[PDB]
Each structure stands twice: as C-alpha cells, then as structure tokens.
C-alpha cells in the first residue's frame, strides 16, 4: 500500500516550535513532489508548502513564509516541516501529501473530499 | 459472385455518404473555437456566462465578428479534476476566472493556475485570465479594514510597473493591489512558458459588457502565434 | 469510544498481509527462469483508419473480430469494417466529450459516454434501419470512465464518482451498485465467464466484484499511482494493471498478490491501455510516449515496440480471435497491427 | 458519537477479504504457464501466420 | 565596319584566385546548411508537414543550384575549356534554370502560405500533408522544368578559331532553328529579369506587406515585439534575396544594352561584365545559402536540432 | 558571327 503516516504535533504554547515528520513507504519517495496541506477547524483544506524531488525547489503560502521551512531526506524516505513561532491561527490538522504522478511539476491534491495519497493527519494545538 | 460484389459496392456507397457527412462536419467543427471556462465557485463565472448569453456541462455559444465560440463549464464533477481536464487538450484557450477580492482563496487560485500551466497535457494551451470583481477589490482596498500583506508578505516590497495604465480616478493603492494580483499569475506563467503558450490578463466587473470582445481578441493572437510557430517564423 | 474498532481495523491489514507473504512461495521469475523467450515480434501496421476529426479516446471490437467501434471527442462514434477499411455507421453524439465505447456481444447495440455523466446505448439494427439512441442511462454523478456489456440487456459501468454500477437497459435503472473505491474508477474488464469483473481506480488499487451478489471479493494493491488500464488474463484467473507510475503489474485472483512487474528504467511515462493476446503470453501496453510495447507476460521481457503514433496512445484492443491488435491514439487515427 | 456507524466499513470488506482461501504463488505460476503453453499455436501474435490466412494482408 | 579591339580580354590571376577562395567557402557553407536542413526535414518524422515540405522543396532546389552551378563555374574560371562535350552542354544549363525556377517559385509559395496562415484561423496539425500543398509542390517543379526546356533546346557546341588558336565552346547558338528559339534568343535576358527576379520580388513583397498589415493594423506589448521581429526577418529575407540575385541579371541587361558592335572599347566593357557575372554566380549561390541561416536565426523549433 | 561575343561566352558563366 501507498502509506503516508505523520508524526509530531501536539499542544504548543503561542510561539515555540514543532517538527512534523511524514514517513513514506510503499512508493519511491525520491521520485515525487511532496506537499503539506492544512485544514483549520471549521474551514476547508489549505495548501501549506511543497518541495520538489531533490529539495532544490521550495514554495510556501505567504501566511507562513518565514515561520515554516520544509525539508526532506530521500535516503530515509521522510519529509519534515519545521514550524517556528506558531500563531494561534496556525492550529489545524496537517497532512503530508504526495503529488499524483511521478516526474511532474503539477499537482491536484487540496481536496475538500478524500484524496488517495495523503496521510491520516496530525492536529497541532496552540 | 453477384451477391458478394453487390454487397461490397453497397458498402462502398454507404461509406461515401459517411465521408460526405464527415467532410461537412469537419467544416463546422474546425469553424468553431472551443474554450474551457474554469475557476472557483465564488468566482463570478455566472456573470460572464450571462454576458455572453445576452448576445452537467453548462455549454455557452456566442458569436463575435462572425466567429463562433463555444465555452464549456464542467460543473457536474467532484473536486478531483486531474483526470477529466485531459479531455480539453484541443481547446483554443482556457478562460481562468479569479476573484481578486478574496485574499483567502488567492493562493488556491494561484496553485490551480500553476498546476494547469505546467500540466503535461495542457502545457500547449494559452490562458485568458479574467480578474473578476474589481469593484469589490477597490471597495475593500479603500476600506482599509483588510490588508493584502497578511496573505502575501512580498506586497510591502512591490511598486507598480511603468506600463500600468490606471483608469481615471483610481487611488494608487487600488492599482498597486490589482497589479500585484496580476503579477503573481504572470510570474507563474513566465516561469516555464517556453514560448509554447501565453497568459493574457484582463480586468473585469459584473457589469462589464466587453468580455466577449476580449475573448475574441485574445483568441486571435493565440491562433496567430500558433500559426507563426507552425510556419517556423516564431 | 472507538478504540476497539480502530485497533481491529488496523490489525486486520497485517493479518491479511502476513497470509499473503506466507503464500508467497516463489517469485514467478524463479519458476519461469528456463522457459524460452517469445523472440522479437516484428508486428507491422496493416491498416490505418482515418476520418475521426479529433482525439480518439476509446475503441472496442465486436465478437466477430471484423467490426470496430471507436469514439472521438469531436462527437462521433464510427463503426469501421477493419478488413475493408470502410465505415458502416457514423453516430452523432449529443455531447462531444465521450470517454468510452463498447460493442454489445450480439452486435445489435453500441454504448458510449463521458463528461455528460450519461451512458447512452445505441441501436444498430432498428426496423427503420438508421442508427438511433435506445436508452440514456442516468444516475451516475460523475463522468463515465468505462462501460462493458454482459448481454444485450445488462451493461456494467464505471464513473468518476468512485462507484461502479450495473444497469438494466429495458428498465433503465440500476440493479446493483458497487462501492468501496476511494478514487475515480477508470476502467473495468469483465471476466471471460462473465461472473466477476475487476476495476482499477485512482487510489493505487484494483478491486474484484461479483456481478450477482454485488459484494467486494478482493482488493488488489501494489501500484504507486492511479491505475488507467485493466485487462483479464484470458484464463480468467489473473489480470494486468496499467498505472501512471510507468509500470504494469500482473495480479492473480487466487494468490491474492502481484505476480510480476513490467517496468524499465527508460520508461518514465504512464500506461494508458493494457490488453493481453489470445494465449496470454504477450502483454501489450500503450504509453504516453506514443509507443505501445509488447511484454512477455511470463518473463517480463520487452519483446517489441509498435512505434507508429504521434501523440499518446489512448486505447488498445485485441480481436477475440487474436489475429490483430487495434491501437487508437490522440493522433485521431486507428491502426491495426499483426 | 456518530462515527461508530461509519467506522464499520473500514473493517467489514477487509474481513470478508481475509477469510477467502488462497493458493501458493508457485501454483498460480503453474496455471499461467500451462495455459500459455496450451494455446501457443492458436495465437497469431506469438507465431506469425501465413499471409493467406491473415485477413489484413 | 567593326574595328579591332583596343586591348585583350582576360580574367586576372588574382581575380581567379580570390573568386575560387570565396567559391569554396560558399560551397562548403551552403552544402552544410542545406544538408542540415534536409537532415532535420527527412530524419525526424515529427517535423515533416505541409508548411515544411515547401521548405524542403526550396532546400532541394538550392542543393541543385549549388552542386550543378558552383563546381562547373569555379572550374571554368580557371581552365577556360569545355570538358564534358556536346551531351552535357544541353543538360547543365537546363537543370540550372529548372532549379532557379524551383527556388523562386518556392519562395513565392512560402509567402502565399504564410499570408494564409496569419490571415485565417486554426491552421495547426501534427504530422500531416494537405492535398493542396502536395499538389502545388509538384506543380511548381513541373512548371519550372517546362519553362526551362527551351534552355536545353537552344544550346549547342561549336568549335571556333580565335587568336590563332582552336577552341570549342558551349553557348546558346547565335543561329536558331525556329521562330520560337529566335524569340527566346532575343528575349532571354529580359525574360529572366522579369519572371525569375521581378515576379518573385513582386509576389513576395505584395503578400508580405499584406501579412504585415494584418499583423500590425489589428489587435500584452511583448506580442508587439514578436510581430515586429517577424516582420523584420521576413523583409530582410526579401531584401537579401533581391540583393543576392540582382548583379547577375544586371550583368545580362547591361550586356544587352551597352554592347555596341562599332565601339573599339566594347571589350573593356566586356571584361568588366565578366567580372560582374563571376561575382553574380557566387552571390546567387549565397542566396541559397542564407535560407538555412535565417531558419537557424529565427526558428526556435529548428535551433533545438540544427546546431549545438 | 562576331567573334568577341563567342569568346565572352567561352569564358562567361553558364547562363
């Protein structure tokens, strides 16, 4: 199975920092663009940031640029999101998501309904 | 002997009528242009649809200078569009309609544009970009109760291009805001265009009557560029 | 609250996985190491069929291995005479966005559908003689990805709303609904014995259904991305998969796990169609790189390439007799190979 | 909570799936190889046929 | 009565050397460019289509004009003798004029096709060859050969005695068998100046002016830059064709107009005209050379494969 | 014939 499982999160005092870890198994992690998506309580899915296959290309939503920084370790098939100075508005369920097909720069993965290649999610409370 | 050749000639006669009908249908088909009207639910797609029609696919047909346009809005689908979007490889252009006043959804719109632009199968189709609801954007900007910096930190370090042609009476704030919104999409498009396709940005309102003229104009240049690339002029 | 349910649901997956691993006695390669190769298949394009105005999305053969139906996204469903290259009928569609076509086994009806979400059945043996609609099946809330006939009055369908349905044409309404897919179901292949059928979806899985009961018998996984093609092994005890991860895999119903993987490092494009030969030795897979390759189904050896298309190959089909292979592509031409 | 009703389908289908018997992969390979060998001479693609019998000559 | 000359008619050794030097460079450059164009058009199946088969016709015609006009004339500039004898004297000029007609008519066809492309809508396809274009290419070849037939008909070989020496020379015979041949003898220079210089210039300038009007008189600003650049390249192509071809036709016209049989100095004029003609052949070949260079300069689609 | 034009044709380009 294409399994993505998130780790980290939990209660954090306003400010501080966290580190989210998504372990990718069952598929060639090195070959896929990967993303983080958030769903705040009472709100729809939002896309947080994305990292290309190698890590030489990166992008964030403006609301978090300078607070978050993505990282990946291909050799260990793991994706990281380091969050610093969490504002209370950052409380949401964060999911590690994988773009549908390999070797492409396009992705359609922030869905209000279910989407196949995405983890169960982790809730971060500020 | 007689029966076999009779049947074979009858089959040829039927194929001849089929060929005639296909020829006339090719004339009609290639006479029309096909557009994929795409955008968010809150985008004023209905206003544009009404503007054309004054003259679950909500097909819309309109005619400018004896040129027949055909506009499609795929509204009977789920949110996972990555598979049915491939049906529209042949369309002349994609009409992308964007709410320029809803800052929360601007990043979603930009991501959708980025995906459409770089998609393996749609990276040959130009995009006519309609920044809708400009009166709402202006009212929100002069209202001051909302700031675009909170959603796009780069706004504090942006200045209007010299080529900006603000309409009369506009505050510098509103022109700067709308041109930043335009420049985000232009950045995405110019990042990987490779001269295969171009994005044509426009501003429009709910009471604008010239959107069909804009689509005609933009389609003319899209076809012109495709033809010049086909004949190696570039 | 739901701790017991969660624990049992999580543990059942490992329960199935361990049994599969234990049943994994020996890889198919170890059993097929010594068997002869097919050689190199020099298949040539025999006929080229022209007349479609736009991209060809679907193509299907008749039971008699002569008549051929193809649907183009210009709003036409042509029936070709493959031997003669002539046409028989040109059905104008009410919607231009057809995505699938099927030939009824009896040959009296032909089906098509697409983004209109309606599966339209046509009659080619009307009393008046002119092709005309016979029913417009409605009820799916998504684009029709694939449809196949079980007989003249039953058609099995797959829709982008993540459900498969079984229709009764005379009644015009569903009889059994298949749910369990997480993503868009993209293709189905009815079993040779027409008792079961398997469908692959955009969730990296394929599922085996029972036409009579409607239950899900088995879910097959192992692909990394969306599955775009499915085809039953002629014996009816296996099926091949095509996916966007640029690999094809062969699954076995009884073993309940992948038996062989068909991939190459120089192939980075997806599979668009999959179809076996009559004997099951040759597996033909269309690709987005405009090339249809021939995989030896027992040794995973690429025995040939059918390079004749510009733009991606859309549909692939082998005659029931096995004397030819039909290839449709977005180049708007159909090419018959043997 | 209302999620109890929905939580059942995560189990049910996989549970009907688990109990169905299985055959060793070597035996499945035997089935496939035997079927391929049996119909070898009835496959115009595995063995190209004379042009006279091929309709598309 | 005509009196003798004031002086000798000759081709200077330095002039021979410099002309040969330029001629070898022209031969190599044109052959390389046209060979690359032919490779692109005939090796990759994806790049062969209606628009490109006219370019292929032009390239083939240019290859003929180089390979059957440069090697013969570069030799003649040195040897001053006719090697191949009677059989070839009827073939070389005929194929030469056929190829020139092919080149000019193909340029006209490209102009017409480009105007049609800019004017109308939806002229895009992958691999494909419209029946009209396949008809027109072969029609152009046929009409060029039909117009060139008189070339082969009129030429002959004559042995002559000159300056106390024996020579055999191939020329369009001063005495002609029939009235049609005499008309050709009396009109050839102007016929060439009209149909092969003035008709291509007219039918190219008219159509390219219409195309530039269609592009500029009707509706971001970068597309204005693209239109300006396309119009520029098109009109420089027309201008370079005109200037490359001009001197040869001009030499023929001046020969027809200024050569007075009663003028003792007529052979000074004639020696000058020989220099001008020998320049004209090289620059006429340069005309064929410039086409692939222009394609490499302005066609991005070709630059991907033309050269590293 | 006028021999000078013949000599011209002798050295002149084939045209």
């Amino acid at each position: 199975q294409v399994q993505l499982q998130e780790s980290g999160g939990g209660l954090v005092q306003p400010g501080g920092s966290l580190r989210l870890s998504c372990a990718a198994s069952g598929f060639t992690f090195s070959n896929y663009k990967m993303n983080w998506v958030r769903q705040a309580p009472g709100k729809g899915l939002e896309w947080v940031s994305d990292i290309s296959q190698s890590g030489a290309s990166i992008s964030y939503t403006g609301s978090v640029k300078g607070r978050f920084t993505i990282s990946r370790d291909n050799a260990k098939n793991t994706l990281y999101l380091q969050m610093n100075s969490l504002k209370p508005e950052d409380t949401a369920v964060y999911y590690c998501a994988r773009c549908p097909a390999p070797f492409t720069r396009d992705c359609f993965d922030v869905t209000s309904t279910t989407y196949a290649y995405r983890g169960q999610g982790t809730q971060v409370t500020v | 002997t007689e029966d076999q050749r009779n049947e074979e000639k009858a089959q040829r006669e039927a194929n001849k009528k089929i060929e005639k009908q296909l020829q006339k249908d090719k004339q009609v088909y290639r006479a029309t242009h096909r557009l994929l009207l795409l955008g968010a639910d809150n985008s004023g797609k209905s206003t544009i649809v009404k503007q054309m029609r004054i003259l679950g696919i909500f097909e819309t047909k309109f005619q400018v200078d004896k040129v027949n346009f055909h506009m499609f809005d795929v509204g009977g689908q789920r949110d996972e569009r990555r598979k049915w979007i491939q049906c529209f490889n042949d369309v002349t252009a994609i009409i992308f309609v964007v709410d320029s006043s809803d800052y929360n959804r601007l990043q979603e719109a930009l991501n959708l544009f980025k995906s459409i632009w770089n998609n393996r199968w749609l990276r040959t189709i130009s995009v006519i970009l309609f920044l809708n609801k400009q009166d709402l954007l202006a009212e929100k900007v002069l209202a001051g109760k909302s700031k675009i910096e909170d959603y796009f930190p780069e706004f504090a370090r942006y200045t209007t291009p010299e080529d900006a042609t603000p309409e009369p009476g506009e505050d510098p704030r509103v022109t700067r805001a709308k041109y930043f919104i335009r420049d985000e999409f232009l950045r995405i498009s110019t990042a990987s265009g490779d001269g295969r396709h171009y994005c044509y940005p426009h501003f429009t309102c709910a009471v604008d009557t010239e959107n069909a003229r804009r689509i005609f104009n933009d389609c003319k240049d899209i076809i012109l560029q495709m033809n010049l690339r086909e004949y190696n002029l570039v | 609250e739901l701790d017991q349910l969660r624990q049992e649901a999580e543990q059942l997956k490992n329960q199935i996985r361990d049994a599969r691993k234990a049943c994994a006695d020996a890889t198919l390669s170890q059993i097929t190491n010594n068997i002869d190769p097919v050689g190199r298949i020099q298949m040539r394009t025999r006929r080229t069929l022209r007349g479609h105005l736009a991209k060809i999305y679907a193509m299907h053969w008749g039971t008699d291995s002569r008549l051929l139906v193809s649907a183009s996204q210009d709003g036409k469903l042509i029936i070709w005479d493959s031997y003669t290259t002539n046409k028989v009928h040109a059905i104008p569609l009410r919607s231009s966005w057809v995505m699938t076509c099927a030939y009824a086994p009896s040959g009296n009806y032909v089906a098509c559908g697409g983004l209109d979400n309606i599966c339209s059945i046509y009659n080619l043996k009307t009393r008046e003689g002119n092709v005309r609609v016979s029913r417009e099946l409605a009820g799916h809330t998504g684009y029709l990805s694939c449809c196949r006939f079980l007989d003249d009055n039953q058609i099995v369908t797959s829709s982008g709303d993540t459900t498969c349905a079984l229709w009764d044409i005379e009644t015009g309404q569903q009889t059994t609904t298949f749910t369990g897919h997480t993503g868009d179901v993209m293709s189905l292949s009815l079993a040779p014995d027409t008792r079961l059928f398997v469908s692959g979806a955009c969730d990296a899985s394929a599922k085996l259904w029972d036409v009579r009961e409607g239950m899900c018998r088995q879910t097959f996984t192992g692909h990394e991305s969306d599955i775009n093609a499915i085809c039953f092994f002629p014996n009816g005890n296996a099926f091949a998969t095509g996916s966007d991860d640029a690999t094809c895999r062969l699954f076995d119903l009884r073993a309940d796990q992948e038996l062989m993987t068909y991939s190459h490092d120089n192939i980075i494009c997806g599979i668009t169609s999959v179809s076996f030969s009559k004997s099951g030795r040759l597996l033909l897979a269309g690709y987005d790189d405009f090339n249809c390759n021939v995989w030896d189904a027992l040794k995973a050896d690429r025995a040939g390439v059918l390079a004749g298309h510009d733009n991606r190959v859309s549909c692939l089909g082998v005659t029931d007799d096995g004397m030819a292979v039909a290839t449709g592509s977005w180049d708007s031409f159909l090419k018959i190979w043997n | 909570t209302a999620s109890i009703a929905q939580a059942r389908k995560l189990v049910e289908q996989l549970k009907m799936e688990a109990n169905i018997d299985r055959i060793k992969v070597s035996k499945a390979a035997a089935d496939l190889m035997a079927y391929c060998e049996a119909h070898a001479k009835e496959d115009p693609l595995l063995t190209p046929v004379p042009a006279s019998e091929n309709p598309f000559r | 009565s005509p009196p003798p000359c004031q002086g000798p008619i000759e081709i200077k050794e330095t002039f021979k050397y410099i002309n040969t030097v330029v001629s070898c460079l022209v031969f190599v450059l044109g052959i390389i460019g046209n060979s690359t164009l032919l490779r692109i058009i005939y090796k990759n199946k994806c790049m062969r289509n209606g628009p490109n088969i006219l370019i292929a016709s032009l390239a083939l015609g240019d290859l003929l004009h180089i390979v059957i006009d440069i090697p013969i004339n570069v030799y003649k500039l040195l040897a001053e003798d006719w090697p191949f004898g009677a059989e070839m004297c009827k073939l070389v000029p005929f194929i030469q004029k056929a190829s020139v007609g092919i080149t000019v008519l193909s340029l006209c066809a490209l102009s017409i096709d480009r105007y049609r492309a800019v004017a109308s809508w939806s002229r895009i396809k992958g691999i494909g060859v419209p029946k009209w274009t396949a008809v027109e290419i072969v029609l152009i070849w046929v009409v060029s050969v039909v117009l060139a037939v008189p070339e082969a008909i009129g030429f002959d070989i004559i042995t002559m005695d000159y300056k106390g020496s024996y020579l055999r020379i191939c020329l369009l015979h001063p005495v002609q068998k029939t009235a049609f041949m005499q008309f050709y003898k009396t009109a050839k220079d102007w016929w060439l100046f009209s149909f092969y210089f003035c008709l291509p210039l007219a039918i190219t300038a008219f159509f390219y002016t219409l195309m530039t009007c269609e592009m500029l008189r009707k509706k971001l600003n970068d597309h204005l830059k693209q239109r300006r650049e396309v119009a520029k390249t098109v009109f420089c192509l027309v201008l370079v064709f005109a200037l490359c071809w001009l001197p040869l036709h001009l030499s023929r016209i001046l020969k027809l107009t200024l050569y007075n049989q009663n003028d003792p100095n007529r052979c000074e004029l004639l020696s000058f005209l020989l220099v001008l003609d020998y320049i004209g052949i090289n620059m006429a070949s340069l005309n064929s050379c410039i086409n692939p260079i222009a394609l490499y300069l302005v066609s991005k689609r070709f630059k991907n494969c033309f050269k590293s | 014939m006028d021999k000078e034009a013949v000599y011209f044709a002798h050295l002149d380009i084939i045209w």
Side-chain angles (χ1 to χ4, degrees), chain F residues 1-14:
Chain F
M1 257 66 98
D2 87 328
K3 61 199 217 143
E4 319 318 332
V6 202
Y7 200 51
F8 167 82
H10 167 222
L11 305 318
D12 183 34
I13 88 164
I14 325 312

Side-chain angles (χ1 to χ4, degrees), chain D residues 9 24 34 37 42:
Chain D
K9 299 299 176 189
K24 299 191 185 189
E37 288 316 65
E42 298 146 272

